[PDB]
């Protein structure tokens, strides 16, 4: 099994750097050498996740200054949403730097996502390109690929594209509005987002996603049918077993509750919620009477979690709940026998981590294409969790709608609660099956070696 030299070149977002680095650890585990291209200051945030420093080498780059970007801005963590397009422009301006690095390091394959110009660069040097995408393949499979004679409408998305392996996915009016307006989004250097991604899909040597044949397989196959080129699966990318210790504040606090009784809620941990929603969420948790630990950033216009909390809250939940604005070991809290519920924002890494533990799944998707599709996949197709309901037009939850979803899954007599737990258990048993993750990756590496 000959050894590969891959370069990893993900979009300037921790949500993309981090999954690329986990995958880099799986590949390095098999002897493959990785050059991991990363914004230079961001590298310090990621070095500790490198579990193969001998084989995984960081290649720090300057993220160029663009007018409008704050000083030293590197990733989407440094700017509001309205400025992501300038991060994309900055990334486009690194091409000549990348070409130097590719000429001297000479990897055999480059993994990329948003760099539509990357396939021509690598092809010109005899280097293969894999567009490694962080979304679930169901997201491009369902949201693209309709007949194009007129602009796509909200009503068009209410039906699946022709040949889509499955029935129509439910989409609320607010989500439909968001989805249609996203098709027009300009993202860096004046390129339409959709053109940026589709150029990469077409000119790469292969497209790849996280996933396994039993769940993501049909969507990969469908896409391979639409574009007539390889769409690979890299495996479920399960968390590596890390011999670590949970923070004593939590091993104590969590240990003082009956097993399976605590609600962990990571909603609002990636991006600050608007104040109205932060309150309804926290009030939502308290109104379930269950123990809860809410890991989230302070809301917009607020610098601390304590300065945000509604007056009276901290008293009324003294024993029951905790609202904690500091860094948490989420994988490890979920591995605690006391946690029984998981409120996820439905990012791909969050979904995998909830799936491989025993907690019930509550799905509160943060507005986004892959987030919405994940929540629908989890709650209406695989039926492994319950969604929090939102206003049909305004997309907001309430303390009541938050309370219902966790009460449904936390009621051992509710028939939906029993159903989602059993389907969850089924998916967990597959993902942790003995051969699943390891043969996925070996097969992936066979397919990578087949591109040479």
Author numbering: 3 to 454
The publication says:
This selectivity was highly related with the unique 45-amino acid PSPG box and the key RLGSDH sugar binding motif.
In order to dissect the mechanisms, we obtained the apo crystal structure of GuApiGT with a resolution of 2.2 Å. Due to the low amino acid sequence identity with reported structures, the structure of GuApiGT was solved by molecular replacement with the help of AlphaFold2 simulation. The crystal contains two highly similar molecules with a root mean square deviation (RMSD) of 1.1 Å, and adopts a canonical GT-B fold consisting of two Rossmann-like β/α/β domains that face each other and are separated by a deep cleft. The N-terminal domain (NTD, residues 1-242 and 436-454) and the C-terminal domain (CTD, residues 243-435) are responsible primarily for sugar acceptor and sugar donor binding, respectively. Based on the structures of GgCGT/UDP-Glc, GgCGT/UDP-Gal, and UGT89C1/UDP-Rha, we simulated the UDP-Api binding pocket of GuApiGT. Moreover, the plant secondary product glycosyltransferase box (PSPG box) of GuApiGT contains 45 amino acids due to the additional S371 residue. Representative snapshots of GuApiGT/UDP-Api/2 complex model indicate that D372, H373, and I136 could form hydrogen bonds with the apiose OH group.
